[PDB]
Amino acid sequence: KEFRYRGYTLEQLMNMSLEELAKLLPARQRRSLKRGLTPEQKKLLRKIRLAKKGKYNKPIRTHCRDMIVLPEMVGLTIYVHNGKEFVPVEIKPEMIGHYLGEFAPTRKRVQHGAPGIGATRSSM
Amino acid sequence: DFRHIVRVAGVDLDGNKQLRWALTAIKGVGINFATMVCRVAGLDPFMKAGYLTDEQVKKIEEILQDPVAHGIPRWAVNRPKDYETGRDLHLITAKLDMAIREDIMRLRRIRAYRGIRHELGLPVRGQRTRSNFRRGQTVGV
RNA sequence: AGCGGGGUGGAGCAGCCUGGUAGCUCGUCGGGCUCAUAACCCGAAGAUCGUCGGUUCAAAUCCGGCCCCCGCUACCA
RNA sequence: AUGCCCCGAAACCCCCGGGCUACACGCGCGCUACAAUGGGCGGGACAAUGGGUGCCGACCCCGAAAGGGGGAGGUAAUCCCCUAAACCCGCCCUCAGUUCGGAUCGCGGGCUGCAACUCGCCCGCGUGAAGCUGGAAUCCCUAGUACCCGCGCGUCAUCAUCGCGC
Ligand code: MET
Numbered sequence: 001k002e003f004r005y006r007g008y009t010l011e012q013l014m015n016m017s018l019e020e021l022a023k024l025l026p027a028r029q030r031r032s033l034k035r036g037l038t039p040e041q042k043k044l045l046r047k048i049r050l051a052k053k054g055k056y057n058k059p060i061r062t063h064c065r066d067m068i069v070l071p072e073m074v075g076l077t078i079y080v081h082n083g084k085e086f087v088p089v090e091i092k093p094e095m096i097g098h099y100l101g102e103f104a105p106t107r108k109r110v111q112h113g114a115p116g117i118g119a120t121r122s123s124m
Numbered sequence: 125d126f127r128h129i130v131r132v133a134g135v136d137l138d139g140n141k142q143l144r145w146a147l148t149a150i151k152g153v154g155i156n157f158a159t160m161v162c163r164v165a166g167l168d169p170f171m172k173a174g175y176l177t178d179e180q181v182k183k184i185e186e187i188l189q190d191p192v193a194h195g196i197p198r199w200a201v202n203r204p205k206d207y208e209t210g211r212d213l214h215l216i217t218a219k220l221d222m223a224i225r226e227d228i229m230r231l232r233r234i235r236a237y238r239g240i241r242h243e244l245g246l247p248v249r250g251q252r253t254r255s256n257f258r259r260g261q262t263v264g265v
Numbered sequence: 266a267g268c269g270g271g272g273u274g275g276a277g278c279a280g281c282c283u284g285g286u287a288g289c290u291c292g293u294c295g296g297g298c299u300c301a302u303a304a305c306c307c308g309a310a311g312a313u314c315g316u317c318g319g320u321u322c323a324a325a326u327c328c329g330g331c332c333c334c335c336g337c338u339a340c341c342a
Numbered sequence: 343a344u345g346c347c348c349c350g351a352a353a354c355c356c357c358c359g360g361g362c363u364a365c366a367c368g369c370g371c372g373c374u375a376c377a378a379u380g381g382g383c384g385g386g387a388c389a390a391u392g393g394g395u396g397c398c399g400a401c402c403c404c405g406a407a408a409g410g411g412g413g414a415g416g417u418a419a420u421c422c423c424c425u426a427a428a429c430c431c432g433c434c435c436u437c438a439g440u441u442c443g444g445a446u447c448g449c450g451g452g453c454u455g456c457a458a459c460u461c462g463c464c465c466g467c468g469u470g471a472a473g474c475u476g477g478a479a480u481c482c483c484u485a486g487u488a489c490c491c492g493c494g495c496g497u498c499a500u501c502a503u504c505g506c507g508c
Pocket residue numbers: 342
């Protein structure tokens with residue numbers, strides 16, 4: 001019942017170089033990592049590593065909806081902007097390889113009301 | 125010799141069809157993969173399925189168990205780079221169905237966007253929904 | 266309590282005597298035609314048949330007891 | 343371009359993230375089909391208009407494909423895009439929701455870009471929805487015209503079921 005990503009445990013994924021990890025992700029993530037990180041993602045990664053070291057005991061909030069979830073981010077809680085607010089996301093091991101924005105929906109679910117005037121030919 | 129019904133891997137096959145088309149009744153085997161397995165097994169793809177012998181059926185099922193080990197390219201299987209073991213696998217029947225169900229369940233557990241779309245029964249791959257994809261009854265004004 | 270009658274889409278009848286769709290008018294929803302509304306034309310939803318059995322290859326109704334309803338009469342505590 | 347009225351430390355000027363892409367439903371214009379006046383596999387034929395230096399790229403090598411690494415010539419009647427499809431020949435299927443149809447979904451591989459989840463395009467294997475010719479109504483067209491078949495340019499870093507042309 002333990003977690004394995006390609007036959008590797010979480011600890012094995014922890015002790016992997018960034019280039020080595022990219023060979024296990026899908027094509028899109030591998031290309032994105034091969035081209036390097038944007039400066040904003042660099043700042044976010046610095047904050048995450050600082051929090052892991054035992055410092056920065058504050059909520060982590062970000063605008064970087066296109067950041068790829070990495071194995072070293074497992075166990076934290078991140079607040080991703082959805083357009084008007086930061087929603088909390090609890091990172092689980094099975095989230096490796098996905099963008100952050102996948103967990104912060106931007107639109108509200110639709111519940112339809114009664115059709116109005118002009119909705120049909122006879123109602124105009 | 126001729127048998128009007130032949131059972132392969134738990135599926136009954138027509139005996140009057142060509143082998144390449146007879147094998148497509150198995151869920152998880154298309155026309156191309158069937159031709160590949162027929163050529164690997166050293167059988168004429170155009171032979172009637174009703175002339176098979178027991179050893180040939182055994183060979184075909186063995187090939188279907190582990191196709192990669194028998195010379196089929198790694199890019200022709202229907203589940204390469206498995207999520208758990210990391211190997212290249214080919215699945216048929218029930219195992220295929222439960223693998224797909226497990227993938228969708230994994231998507232749903234983490235509350236990903238595609239998981240919500242699967243739950244609500246809405247298009248997943250970015251289609252527009254204002255005009256088409258209508259399945260219901262007209263509402264009156 | 267006795268006698269007679271029938272229960273058929275949301276409404277009103279065919280449908281049983283002569284067995285082969287559950288059919289006919291109104292109604293609800295949608296579309297046509299017109300610059301537009303009314304009139305007019307078209308399509309769809311809606312009664313698995315109100316329970317069992319006998320008949321029949323085939324009916325509900327042909328018949329039978331049950332479900333309740335309707336009408337007339339009897340009925341002096 | 344411009345009169346009047348308004349805002350004039352915001353209704354002006356920048357940056358980040360969202361939306362214009364939502365979805366019980368009504369409608370317009372189209373594409374793909376409902377198969378033999380066909381589907382698949384191998385082989386054989388014949389164009390025109392246009393465009394190219396922030397670009398078109400022959401030719402060689404690697405890869406199953408999408409693609410990748412070098413790179414002649416071209417500021418162009420000189421080099422390149424550029425050996426079209428419908429059509430013809432041979433074999434399989436024989437009236438069936440099928441060897442018809444290819445919507446929907448799973449896994450994997452790529453390109454453009456500062457960025458691909460919301461929300462891009464391409465490739466391999468798998469899966470296999472409605473649809474068996476369409477009521478009342480209603481549209482276009484008189485000759486190289488209508489029908490059928492592909493191609494070029496515009497938009498354009500990437501993206502054509504569109505517009506204008508051949
Ligand atoms: C009237 O006669 C009366 N007493 C009859 C019986 S009452 C239950």
